[PDB]
Each structure stands twice: as C-alpha cells, then as structure tokens.
Amino acid sequence: KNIDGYFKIYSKHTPINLVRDLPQGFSALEPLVDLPIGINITRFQTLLA
Amino acid sequence: DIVMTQSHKFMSTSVGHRVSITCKASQDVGNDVAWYQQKPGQSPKLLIYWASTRHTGVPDRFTGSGSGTDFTLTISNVQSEDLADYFCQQYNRYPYTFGGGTKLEIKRADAAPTVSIFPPSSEQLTSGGASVVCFLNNFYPKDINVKWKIDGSERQNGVLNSWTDQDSKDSTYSMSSTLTLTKDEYERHNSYTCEATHKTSTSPIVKSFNRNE
Amino acid sequence: SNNLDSKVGGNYNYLYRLFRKSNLKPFERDISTEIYQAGSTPCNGVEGFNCYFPLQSYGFQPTNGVGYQPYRVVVLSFELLHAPATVCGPKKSTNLV
Numbered sequence: 001k002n003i004d005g006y007f008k009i010y011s012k013h014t015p016i017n018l019v020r021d022l023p024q025g026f027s028a029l030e031p032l033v034d035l036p037i038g039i040n041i042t043r044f045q046t047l048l049a
Numbered sequence: 050d051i052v053m054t055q056s057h058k059f060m061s062t063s064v065g066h067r068v069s070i071t072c073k074a075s076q077d078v079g080n081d082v083a084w085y086q087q088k089p090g091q092s093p094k095l096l097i098y099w100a101s102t103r104h105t106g107v108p109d110r111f112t113g114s115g116s117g118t119d120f121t122l123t124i125s126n127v128q129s130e131d132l133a134d135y136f137c138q139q140y141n142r143y144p145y146t147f148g149g150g151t152k153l154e155i156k157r158a159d160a161a162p163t164v165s166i167f168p169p170s171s172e173q174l175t176s177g178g179a180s181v182v183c184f185l186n187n188f189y190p191k192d193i194n195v196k197w198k199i200d201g202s203e204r205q206n207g208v209l210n211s212w213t214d215q216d217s218k219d220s221t222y223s224m225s226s227t228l229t230l231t232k233d234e235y236e237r238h239n240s241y242t243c244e245a246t247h248k249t250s251t252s253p254i255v256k257s258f259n260r261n262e
Numbered sequence: 263s264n265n266l267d268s269k270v271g272g273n274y275n276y277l278y279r280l281f282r283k284s285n286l287k288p289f290e291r292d293i294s295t296e297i298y299q300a301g302s303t304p305c306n307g308v309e310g311f312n313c314y315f316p317l318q319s320y321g322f323q324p325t326n327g328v329g330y331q332p333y334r335v336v337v338l339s340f341e342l343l344h345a346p347a348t349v350c351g352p353k354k355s356t357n358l359v
Contacts, residue, residue, distance in 0.1 A: 004287060004288060005287045005288050005289050005290065006343065008344075031344060033345075034343050034344045034345050036289060036341075036343060037289075038287060038288060038289025038290050039287075039290060040287060040290070052310070052311060052312050054303045054304075054305070054311040054312055055304075055311065056304040056306075057304070057306070058306060073302065073303045073304070075303075075312055148311070149310070149311070
C-alpha cells in the first residue's frame with residue numbers, strides 16, 4: 001500500500017500444503033522495510049520467470 | 050476585443066469519416082451561428098447562416114447544429130473539394146474579430162516526387178544575380194526532406210522555400226526552393242544536385258545537370 | 263539573497279507551476295515544463311484563447327521591495343518513520359540505571 005508517498009512492505013513466509021486453490025487459513029504479516037518514495041503508483045504488473 | 054476560442058487549430062479527416070468542430074465561443078450569439086468557406090486563390094463564400102439553412106451552392110452534406118456558445122459544425126462525407134478554413138464569427142454587428150482557425154487535410158497514400166533541375170539564363174548573370182531552380186511536385190505528405198549539394202558540399206544557408214495548399218483535383222502537394230546566388234558564387238560551381246527523400250521507394254530521385262550543358 | 267540570485271530587470275530564467283488538476287503528494291516534484299489547459303475551453307499549448315495558463319516566472323528585482331526578494335530557503339525535512347532512528351540530537355549519552 002502507498003499512504004501519502006510512504007510505501008510499506010509487509011513480508012511473511014510460511015510452508016503450506018497447496019495444490020491448486022486458495023489456502024483458506026490464517027496468518028499474520030510483519031513489516032520488513034519502509035520506502036518513502038513520494039511518487040504516485042496507479043497501475044502495476046507482475047514479474048514472472 | 051472578442052476572442053473566439055476554438056478547440057482545435059489543425060485537423061485531418063479523410064474521405065468517409067465525420068469531422069466535428071465545436072467552437073466554444075466566449076460570447077452568447079444565440080442563433081447567429083456562421084461559418085466560412087475559403088478556397089485557395091479564390092474569394093471566401095458563406096457556408097451556413099442562422100445554423101439551419103445552407104447557402105446557394107452548398108451541398109446537403111454540410112449540416113450544422115447548436116446555438117449560443119455551444120455549436121458543432123457537423124460535416125460528413127468529406128471530399129477533395131471541401132478544402133476550406135472555418136472561422137467562428139457572427140453576423141449581427143461590427144467589428145468582425147476572428148480567431149485562429151482550423152485547417153482540414155484529406156488523408157491519402159504517399160507519392161514519389163518529380164525533381165527537375167533547371168539552370169538560370171545567361172542574361173541574369175549580366176546584372177549580377179543567379180537562382181537555382183529545383184521543383185518538387187506530386188508528393189505526400191508536406192513534410193519532405195530536400196537537400197542541397199553544391200559540388201558535393203551540403204549547403205543549408207540561402208534556401209528560400211515556397212509552399213502551397215492542397216490541390217483540389219487529386220489532392221497533391223507542391224513545394225519549391227530557390228537558391229539565392231550572386232554572380233561570383235555561380236561561376237565558381239558547375240554541377241548542382243537536388244535530391245528528394247520519399248517513402249514509396251528505396252531509391253531516391255537524384256538529378257544532376259552541368260552548367261556547361 | 264537579493265544581491266546574488268536576483269538580476270536587474272527580472273530573473274526570468276526559472277519557472278514554476280501555478281495550476282494543476284490535482285494536488286501533489288509530499289516528496290514529489292513536477293519537472294514537466296509543458297503547458298496544460300485550465301478549464302473547459304481548449305487552448306492547446308501556447309498563450310491565447312482565454313485560458314489560465316500556469317506558465318509564470320520569478321519576478322526577482324534587487325531594487326524592489328522586500329515582498330519580491332529572492333530567499334534561499336533550505337527546508338530541513340525532519341520526519342519520523344517506521345525505520346529505526348539513528349540521526350539523534352547533540353545529547354551526551356549517560357549510563358543505564
């Protein structure tokens with residue numbers, strides 16, 4: 001999310017047994033860094049290998 | 050002064066499409082919506098008066114709509130003879146203060162130009178003047194690249210271009226350039242080269258002619 | 263800095279944006295030197311046809327009043343983010359009690 005130009009990155013890593021669908025579980029995220037970019041982000045894409 | 054604010058200053062519409070020009074006038078004229086029809090080299094003519102009636106000679110394809118400050122000149126089925134400049138004006142009282150204007154262009158395919166290099170006469174060298182003649186006709190679009198080569202050396206100064214409007218018969222363009230030379234600058238050179246760059250072929254039109262003939 | 267930055271006749275070298283369709287976020291600059299429209303009337307760039315253009319220069323004059331003198335303002339942008347703070351003030355660190 002981007003609030004007043006201050007971008008927040010919340011990271012969480014946990015193993016799960018998933019095949020196809022969405023895991024209907026529960027997990028709590030933790031902040032990692034803080035990026036005061038001060039720019040406007042309206043659209044995005046997804047980088048894949 | 051009454052400033053006639055127009056939306057677009059230069060448009061382009063080919064044959065088969067509809068061009069809509071909405072002139073947001075700063076004055077409230079009501080039903081006094083008027084337009085112009087300016088032919089190149091001829092007198093201007095009235096196109097639409099009172100926003101609902103056409104002039105004698107205007108075809109049925111030229112319609113109009115809107116009143117007051119909001120009006121749009123609805124023009125459908127644009128042909129090659131529809132080259133005219135449109136001004137937002139009024140026919141109520143004086144003065145007639147106009148705006149910038151919108152130029153119409155008919156889109157088509159590109160064409161290869163014709164280059165003909167002609168040397169000046171010998172009687173012009175008696176007074177002390179010279180002019181290199183290189184013509185470019187039947188090309189599209191108007192943004193052409195003409196280079197001057199004086200004995201292999203590229204020359205950029207002393208070039209006086211002359212451009213015209215769109216043709217009414219086959220919608221072609223024409224542009225000329227006169228190289229201003231004196232008596233001493235003409236006798237020290239023999240071979241001239243006028244080249245034209247087009248997009249219809251990979252081989253450009255290169256013409257050369259010797260002064261001694 | 264009316265004797266160094268300002269020029270006689272008006273320092274018209276620098277420009278600034280006056281009007282915009284939306285408000286700007288903090289820590290954001292607008293280096294776009296293009297001219298945009300103001301209202302519903304299309305003017306398309308250059309000055310004319312009754313638009314409120316945002317093109318405006320600085321009226322720096324050394325022989326004028328203090329209201330138009332150039333001021334060298336350095337904005338000390340101090341903030342408190344979620345990062346661990348390191349830039350503290352000039353305070354002597356004592357022991358732990």
